[PDB]
């Protein structure tokens, strides 16, 4: 326990929509602090798995991470109180062209994801599923990472999976690197589907044959080399988020 | 009810625009009459009644037309400009 929150202090305001695991509702805890309430649908996730999921997400905090404020276990459904991100899902934020994003702004989003991923890298934490779908954006435009570790609980992200995860199902720190590369493409292609013309079965086969995502019209040669370095056939030659952020900040001042 | 106690009066709302940017093409007198006060960050203004935040102020803007388009449920807005106005702005 010790992270349990009394829902008597919570005040619901707007239903943000239904997603994975449950419904997300915007509220105000103690009448002044903005909170996001994830209502875990009865029997959607494993009860025993909800023990490890919460515990690992609690003792983890970063500037660019969606902070978990706690749980509400003493009632059904079980609530997950977290940091409220106004703009919601990054994928929808990118897909809305009513923002008119600049190349410098899209590169700043990549910096935000990389900064958070470097923290999970040091903590030996694997996201096991990194994409725009599992990334949130606040009112200020800052992109943060969420739904981490949740892949091992409760179709498969084939398009974000490296060759070793496809052919042999071997998860490493370099598996998230490949996923970050496909996410870097998602940002520069503005919420476009990776390998759109190919089905999930064709995607797995073509990745093994050496097919890599094309350079989007927005990304320059330098930025495309950053996302391409993530897509090395041999995982040993893929960089780290420390090396990736270094290249991101170097190109930022170029 | 009211969101911010300190900014109930126009004279109090105007005091926040002390370090408001002289770059923005929106006059503070217009914002303060529309229940807005400067937050302190670039062009961020909140409402004292509905806590309605508004930024990225462009030229040819009306703080009342922006108050109705984004926050029609604002009790101060319906009190000042009237429901007939609020419904007309939200009607488009
Ligand atoms: Zn208002």
Domain membership flag for residue A60: yes
Q: Are A166 and A209 in contact (CB under 8 A)?
A: no
Exposure class string for A44-76: b at 16+ Cβ within 10 A, else e: ebeeeebeebbeebeebebebbbebbbbbbeee
Q: In sequence order, which residues have a C-beta less than 8 Å from that of residue A162 and are 6 or more positions away?
A: A174, A175, A178, A179, A207, A235
Domain membership flag for residue A1: no
Number of domains in chain A: 2
- Is A41 marked as binding a ligand? no
Domain carrying residue B22: 1-92
Q: Are A141 and A113 in contact (CB under 8 A)?
A: no
Resolution, given in Å to one decimal, reads 3.8
Q: Are A82 and A35 in contact (CB under 8 A)?
A: yes
- Is A104 marked as binding a ligand? no
Can you tell me which residue has the tokens 């990389």?
A: A114
- Tell which residue, A47, A51, A39, has the closest CA to residue A7: A39
Q: Are A38 and A21 in contact (CB under 8 A)?
A: yes
Q: Are residues A70 and A124 in the same domain?
A: no
Q: Which own/partner pairs from B3-12 qualify as long-range (CB within 8 Å, at least 24 positions apart)? A: B3/B46, B3/B47, B3/B48, B3/B49, B3/B50, B3/B51, B4/B37, B4/B46, B4/B47, B4/B48, B4/B51, B6/B48, B7/B35, B7/B37, B7/B48, B8/B48, B12/B37
Domain carrying residue A148: 88-253
Asked, as a colleague might, if the bond just before A27 is cis with ω within 30 of 0, I would say no
Domain membership flag for residue A227: yes
Find the A81 Cα to ligand 1 centroid distance in Å: 27
Structure tokens given for A213: 């995502």
Distance in angstroms (rounded) separating the CA atoms of residues A166 and A187? 23
- Is A1 marked as binding a ligand? no
Distance in angstroms (rounded) separating the CA atoms of residues A101 and A178? 24
Structure tokens given for A9: 């202090």
Chosen domain end from A83, A106, A122: A83
Q: Are residues A21 and A98 in the same domain?
A: no
* Chain breaks in chain B following residues, C–N > 2.5 Å: none
Structure tokens given for A69: 């404020």
Q: Are residues A125 and A220 in the same domain?
A: yes
Q: In sequence order, which residues have a C-beta less than 8 Å from that of residue A203 and are 6 or more positions away?
A: A158, A159, A195
Chosen domain end from A43, A61, A83: A83
- Tell which residue, A95, A103, A84, A89, has the closest CA to residue A27: A84
Distance of CA A59 to the CA centre of its chain: 18
Find the B48 Cα to ligand 1 centroid distance in Å: 6
Chosen domain end from A38, A63, A83: A83
What secondary structure letter does DSSP report for B51? -
Residue B12, Cβ neighbours under 10 Å: how many?
15
Domain membership flag for residue A101: yes
- Is B49 marked as binding a ligand? no
The CA R_g of chain A, rounded to the nearest whole Å, is 19
Q: Are residues A13 and A100 in the same domain?
A: no
Q: Are residues A93 and A204 in the same domain?
A: yes
Find the B74 Cα to ligand 1 centroid distance in Å: 5
Q: Which method resolved this structure?
A: X-ray
Q: In sequence order, which residues have a C-beta less than 8 Å from that of residue B27 and are 6 or more positions away?
A: none
Q: Are residues A75 and A98 in the same domain?
A: no
Q: Are residues A119 and A245 in the same domain?
A: yes
Find the B73 Cα to ligand 1 centroid distance in Å: 8
Using the Cα atoms of residue A39, residue A40, residue A42 and residue A48 in order, give the sign of their dihedral. Answer: negative
CATH of the domain at A168: 1.10.510.10
Find the B24 Cα to ligand 1 centroid distance in Å: 21
Q: Are residues A94 and A69 in the same domain?
A: no
Alpha-carbon distance values, A234 to A171, A178, A192 (Å): 13, 11, 26
Q: Are residues A47 and A105 in the same domain?
A: no
Domain membership flag for residue A2: no
Distance in angstroms (rounded) separating the CA atoms of residues A2 and A80? 14
Q: Are residues A94 and A63 in the same domain?
A: no
Domain membership flag for residue A219: yes
Q: In sequence order, which residues have a C-beta less than 8 Å from that of residue B91 and are 6 or more positions away?
A: none
Distance of CA A97 to the CA centre of its chain: 21
- Is A228 marked as binding a ligand? no
Q: In sequence order, which residues have a C-beta less than 8 Å from that of residue A105 and are 6 or more positions away?
A: A141
CATH of the domain at A31: 3.30.200.20
Q: Are residues A102 and A223 in the same domain?
A: yes
Distance in angstroms (rounded) separating the CA atoms of residues B57 and A236? 49
Strands A78-83 and A88-89: unpaired
Query: Catalytic positions of A, please?
Result: 129
Q: Are residues A50 and A106 in the same domain?
A: no
DSSP of A80-126: EEEE--TTEEHHHHHH--TT---HHHHHHHHHHHHHHHHHHHHTT--
- Tell which residue, B16, B70, B22, B41, has the closest CA to residue B31: B16
């Amino acid at each position: 326990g010790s992270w349990e929150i009394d829902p008597k202090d919570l005040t619901f305001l707007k239903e943000l929509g239904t997603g994975q695991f449950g419904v997300v509702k915007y509220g105000k805890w103690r009448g002044q602090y903005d909170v996001a309430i994830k209502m875990i649908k009865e029997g959607s996730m494993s009860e025993d798995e909800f023990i490890e999921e919460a515990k690992v997400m609690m003792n983890l905090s970063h500037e660019k991470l969606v902070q978990l404020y706690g749980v509400c276990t003493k009632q059904r459904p079980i609530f997950i109180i977290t940091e409220y991100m106004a703009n919601g899902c990054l994928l929808n934020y990118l897909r809305e062209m009513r923002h008119r994003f600049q190349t410098q702004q899209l590169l700043e989003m990549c910096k935000d994801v990389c900064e958070a991923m470097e923290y999970l890298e040091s903590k030996q934490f694997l996201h096991r599923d990194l994409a725009a779908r599992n990334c949130l954006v606040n009112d200020q435009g800052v992109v943060k990472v969420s739904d981490f570790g949740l892949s091992r609980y409760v179709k498969f992200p084939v398009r974000w999976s490296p060759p070793e995860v496809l052919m042999y199902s071997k998860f490493s720190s370099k598996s998230d690197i490949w996923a970050f590369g496909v996410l870097m493409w998602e940002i520069y292609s503005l919420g476009k589907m990776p390998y759109e013309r190919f089905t999930n079965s064709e995607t797995a086969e073509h990745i093994a044959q050496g097919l890599r995502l094309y350079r989007p019209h927005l990304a320059s040669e330098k930025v495309y080399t950053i996302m391409y370095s993530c897509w090395h056939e041999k995982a040993d030659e893929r960089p780290t988020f420390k090396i990736l952020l270094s290249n991101i900040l170097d190109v930022m001042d170029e | 009810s009211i969101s911010n106690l300190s900014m109930q009066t126009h004279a109090a709302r105007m005091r926040t625009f002390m370090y408001w940017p002289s770059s923005v093409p929106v006059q503070p007198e217009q914002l303060a009459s529309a229940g807005f006060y400067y937050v302190g960050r670039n062009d961020d203004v909140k409402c004292f009644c509905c806590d309605g935040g508004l930024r990225c102020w462009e030229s040819g803007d009306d703080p009342w037309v922006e108050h109705a388009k984004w926050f029609p449920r604002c009790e101060f807005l319906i009190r000042m400009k009237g429901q007939e106005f609020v419904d007309e702005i939200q009607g488009r």
